[PDB]
């Protein structure tokens, strides 16, 4: 096994490189999560409550209200640039 | 095995490279999640509650209300550029 | 095994490199989480409450209200640049 | 095993490098969390309450109110730059 | 095993390097948390309350109010620069 990336560079590039080499209730093992990973406004309400939740008798009301004014302005996500003009105006 | 990417570069490129080499209740193992992964406004309400939820007797009302003003303005996602003009105006 | 990244560089590049080499209730082992990972406005309300929550008798009301004015202005996320003009004006 | 990154550099690059080499209720072992990890406005309300919470009889009201004016202005996240002009004006 | 990063440098680069080499109720062992890790406005309300909280009979009201004016202006996060002009004006 032998990988080679970007051996010779002349100039001024804008580079995003990720080299991953692998050789060989909730269970996760022998992994990698989130190599260049972006989460914007990620919501998780109920996750992995437990072994025995709400088992015998339960009266549950679940109101999830996502509202209100929300502005997300991203000029560049995971987007390298060179000799470029990036601007957000208002 | 031998991979080769972008051996020689002259100039100023805008590059997004990802080289992945592999050699050989909820269970996930020996994996990779999210190489250049973007989640915008991702919602997960109920996930993996548990072994015995709401087992015997349950009275559950589930109201998921997604409303309200929401503006997402992304000029570039995973989109490299060179010698370019990127702008968001308002 | 032998990896090689960016052997020779002449100039002024804007570089984001991540080389990962691997050789060989909630359980997570032998992993890596968050190599160049961005979380903006990430919400987790109820997670891994416990072994026996709300077991016998429970009266639970769950109101999750996400509202209000919220402005997120990011000029560049994980986006290196060279010979570039980046600006956020208001 | 032998990795090599950025052997020779001439100039003034803006570099973000992370080399990770691995060789071989809530449980997490033999891992690394947060290599170049950014959390902005991360919220976790109830997590890992305990072995036996709210077991016999519980009357719980849960109101999570996220509101109010909030401005996040980040000119560059994990985004190195060289020969560049970065500005936030108001 | 032998890693090599940034063998020869001529000039004035702006560098962020992190080399990690590994060889071989809440439990976490044999790990590293937070290599170049940034938390801005991170909130954790109830975490790991205890073995037996709210066990027999509980009347709990939970109001989490996040409001008010809040301005976060960061010109550069984990973003080295060289021959650059960085400014925040108001």
Swiss-Prot record, chains A, B, C, D, E:
Tell me the outcome of changing residue 22 to I.
In AMYLD1; Jewish 'SKO' amyloid polyneuropathy
List the carbohydrate attachment sites.
65
UniProt-recorded name of the protein:
Transthyretin
Phenotype for residue 22 to C: In a patient with amyloidosis
Q: In the UniProt annotation, what is the result of changing residue 77 to M?
A: Loss of tetramerization
Q: What species is given as this protein's source?
A: Homo sapiens
Effect listed in the UniProt record for changing residue 26 to K = In AMYLD1; amyloid cardiomyopathy
- What does the subunit section of this Swiss-Prot or TrEMBL entry state? Homotetramer. Dimer of dimers. In the homotetramer, subunits assemble around a central channel that can accommodate two ligand molecules. Interacts with RBP4.
**Briefly, what is this protein's role?**
Thyroid hormone-binding protein. Probably transports thyroxine from the bloodstream to the brain.
Originating gene: TTR
The misc remark on file is:
Tetramer dissociation and partial unfolding leads to the formation of aggregates and amyloid fibrils. Small molecules that occupy at least one of the thyroid hormone binding sites stabilize the tetramer, and thereby stabilize the native state and protect against misfolding and the formation of amyloid fibrils. Two binding sites for thyroxine are located in the channel. Less than 1% of plasma prealbumin molecules are normally involved in thyroxine transport. L-thyroxine binds to the transthyretin by an order of magnitude stronger than does the triiodo-L-thyronine. Thyroxine-binding globulin is the major carrier protein for thyroid hormones in man.
State if Glycoprotein is listed as a keyword: yes
